[PDB]
Amino acid sequence: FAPIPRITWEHREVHLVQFHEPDIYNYSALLLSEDKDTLYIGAREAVFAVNALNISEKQHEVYWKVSEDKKAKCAEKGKSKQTECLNYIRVLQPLSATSLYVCGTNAFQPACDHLNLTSFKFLGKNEDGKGRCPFDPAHSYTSVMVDGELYSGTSYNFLGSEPIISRNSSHSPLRTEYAIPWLNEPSFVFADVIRKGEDDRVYFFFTEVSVEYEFVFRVLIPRIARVCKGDQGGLRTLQKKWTSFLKARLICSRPDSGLVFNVLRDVFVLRSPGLKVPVFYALFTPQLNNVGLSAVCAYNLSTAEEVFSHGKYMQSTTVEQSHTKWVRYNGPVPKPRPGACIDSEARAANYTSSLNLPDKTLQFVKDHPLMDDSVTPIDNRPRLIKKDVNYTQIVVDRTQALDGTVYDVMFVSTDRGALHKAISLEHAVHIIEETQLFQDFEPVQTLLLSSKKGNRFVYAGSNSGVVQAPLAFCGKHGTCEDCVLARDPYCAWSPPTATCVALHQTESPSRGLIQEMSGDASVCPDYRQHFFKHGGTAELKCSQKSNLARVFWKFQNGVLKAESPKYGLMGRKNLLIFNLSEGDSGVYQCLSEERVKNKTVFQVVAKHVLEVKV
Amino acid sequence: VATSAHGEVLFAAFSSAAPPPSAAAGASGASALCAFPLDEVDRLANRTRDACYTREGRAEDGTEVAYIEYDVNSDCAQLPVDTLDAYPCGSDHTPSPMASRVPLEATPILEWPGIQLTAVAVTM
Numbered sequence A: 001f002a003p004i005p006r007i008t009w010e011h012r013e014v015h016l017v018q019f020h021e022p023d024i025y026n027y028s029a030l031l032l033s034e035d036k037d038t039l040y041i042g043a044r045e046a047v048f049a050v051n052a053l054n055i056s057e058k059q060h061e062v063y064w065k066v067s068e069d070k071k072a073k074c075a076e077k078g079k080s081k082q083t084e085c086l087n088y089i090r091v092l093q094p095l096s097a098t099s100l101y102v103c104g105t106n107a108f109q110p111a112c113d114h115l116n117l118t119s120f121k122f123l124g125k126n127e128d129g130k131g132r133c134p135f136d137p138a139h140s141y142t143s144v145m146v147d148g149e150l151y152s153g154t155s156y157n158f159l160g161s162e163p164i165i166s167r168n169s170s171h172s173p174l175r176t177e178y179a180i181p182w183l184n185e186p187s188f189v190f191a192d193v194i195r196k197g198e199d200d201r202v203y204f205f206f207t208e209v210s211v212e213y214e215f216v217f218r219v220l221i222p223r224i225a226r227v228c229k230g231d232q233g234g235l236r237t238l239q240k241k242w243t244s245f246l247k248a249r250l251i252c253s254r255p256d257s258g259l260v261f262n263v264l265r266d267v268f269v270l271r272s273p274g275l276k277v278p279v280f281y282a283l284f285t286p287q288l289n290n291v292g293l294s295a296v297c298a299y300n301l302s303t304a305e306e307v308f309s310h311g312k313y314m315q316s317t318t319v320e321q322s323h324t325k326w327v328r329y330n331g332p333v334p335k336p337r338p339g340a341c342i343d344s345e346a347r348a349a350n351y352t353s354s355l356n357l358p359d360k361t362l363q364f365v366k367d368h369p370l371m372d373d374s375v376t377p378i379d380n381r382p383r384l385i386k387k388d389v390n391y392t393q394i395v396v397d398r399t400q401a402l403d404g405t406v407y408d409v410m411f412v413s414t415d416r417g418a419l420h421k422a423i424s425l426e427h428a429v430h431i432i433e434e435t436q437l438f439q440d441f442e443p444v445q446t447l448l449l450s451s452k453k454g455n456r457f458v459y460a461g462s463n464s465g466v467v468q469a470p471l472a473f474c475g476k477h478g479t480c481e482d483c484v485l486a487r488d489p490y491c492a493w494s495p496p497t498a499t500c501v502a503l504h505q506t507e508s509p510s511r512g513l514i515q516e517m518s519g520d521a522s523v524c525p526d527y528r529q530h531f532f533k534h535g536g537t538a539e540l541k542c543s544q545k546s547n548l549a550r551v552f553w554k555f556q557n558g559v560l561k562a563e564s565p566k567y568g569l570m571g572r573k574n575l576l577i578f579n580l581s582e583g584d585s586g587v588y589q590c591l592s593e594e595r596v597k598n599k600t601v602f603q604v605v606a607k608h609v610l611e612v613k614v
Numbered sequence B: 001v002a003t004s005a006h007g008e009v010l011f012a013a014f015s016s017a018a019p020p021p022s023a024a025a026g027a028s029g030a031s032a033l034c035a036f037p038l039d040e041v042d043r044l045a046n047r048t049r050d051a052c053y054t055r056e057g058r059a060e061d062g063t064e065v066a067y068i069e070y071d072v073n074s075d076c077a078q079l080p081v082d083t084l085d086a087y088p089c090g091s092d093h094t095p096s097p098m099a100s101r102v103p104l105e106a107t108p109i110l111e112w113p114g115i116q117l118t119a120v121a122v123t124m
Ligand SMILES: *[C@@H]1O[C@H](CO)[C@@H](O[C@@H]2O[C@H](CO)[C@@H](O[C@@H]3O[C@H](CO)[C@@H](O)[C@H](O)[C@@H]3O)[C@H](O)[C@H]2NC(C)=O)[C@H](O)[C@H]1NC(C)=O
Pocket: A276, A277, A279, A300, A301, A302, A303, A378
């Protein structure tokens, strides 16, 4: 299990910019512009444009509030008039340079519209968002705009009994089948297009009730799925339906410890400036006995692609003679491959679209959407497993250290408004710091990263507002030792400026900078006076930031024992000399000790010169 | 149904089962004719709807009379009373598909021990 966050930053001790509109709640949708300087917020009954560099600067505002006759219609359907019967923005996507595509629950009448960016006024397109947007603010939902066409995963109805992964195309509308083999009680988590003869694919991530597994209760299972951008459906069968829909198990577990995380919470696509293949960073929690635990598994796209392209499918079979069981299909697979895209191979066999695929192949995919092979993580284990924390959303920044060693920086939000910064150091997790983003411990519902030159920020939304944080707080570190010991690839010590700087931001010289991810503060170069009355009591204040260090006191060059009657420890860090007399005068030193590898790192926290009067 | 025009009573021939759902053949199997007045049919379906809509399929006093069939991710509800009159044929917000726990019971009018009934026509 991952250790405790090395340093805890109170909302008070760091520079965090906040945004909220009075009487406006549920800041669940976040979208930043092309230029990255304008962040758009989708809340309950409102859409805003804020300066992404200072979220507190409100630029534009637009509302989409529900009428009383629509609220009462919703309430008459036994829903909560002042809770669920309101317009929760669920779809906030780029449409053009001059517009956004917006959908809201709208007292259970999913409605879509175009937000005119030049005016920040809605165009009144008033489209029926049934299938595109959920009815209930409680229902799961995911959407990705690909080539001005919305690819959405949510419920097709009011009750949330009909799930749907569909494309609102207008030219070629396509949707999933309303069948258990296709989708079995899913809870949508994330979707994105993975761009390139070879066609683009639109991946979907969700948790659904498993068909392959049987246990005491119904077992959930994380799913990775994909569809082909060029899909047009089948001609005779799969009319207006996906022909390219294949899914597989997403497995996040440490078995030598019986830890299985079968509930997917978030998915982030690490788009490597260097690496040609994207890495999905997926966030999971266990369905069973969650108390709570969180795990972060990283999946190489190539792995998943290997399953969808060459993996054996699963067959459903009748078993004695009213039951259905699912097993590996070892029978003959049709050609062209069921679920495959219109690639170079297909085009050679005179196949231009799904509309001209053989009925043999189309029937196969319709009856075999599920793959036998699981999609496994890189190094076949989670990147991080944490206890006593319920992680909510994830973002990852691939950063180059001073050394040139590349670290994948994990920003993980909690259900209590906190953000953890973690890196997988040499075969062990290091949680650099934790920051309390929300003073009200509101769970971070959404998280969004901008790693772009200048505007390097993380944006977190909750029901109470939005928070803007940098990727590091290098300046909070006082000494070179403190700067190095942090083991943050973002932070380096600058001897000329006598400040711990943010490497890859500051205008300090690279060649003349200090950073050691080993934590060996050895690479570094290197008195509060008091006058108290006789008989009186002294409180010598001492504090440090490491949650992984312990402090001890020293008087007259010896390790002082804070025991009654002469001594006491107030708050485990502040020394208390009780009965002051001639001999108590002199130097009192507060020291810290923290283990890095095998070695211990002692640091002098406080220096005190106590003088007792006569 | 009774015809001379179209009655209000459903006459249904039933046969006892053999060990796909074949009726036990020859003298080992028997048949019966049961009458289920369609108002009795509607009374029960209406009370199955009413329970499932307003009182969680429980129906006072006691209880567990309606549920959602075919494993559909729906449940019975505690909807306003007005739902019954407002939505007789249901809506996007009402539980579906509903089914009764309580069966519609009929005692035979005909009980033939060695015969396997295949067709019914009734007149008056
Ligand atoms: C994600 O999965 C892909 C799929 O294989 C990984 O890519 C491949 O990794 C192998 C392993 O070495 C590469 O093979 C060889 O690399 C050595 C190293 O220099 C080279 O000397 C050999 O001649 C050969 O090239 C293979 O080329 C490479 N292919 C691609 C497209 O990347 C990828 O590394 C995985 N990424 C992660 C983070 O797991």
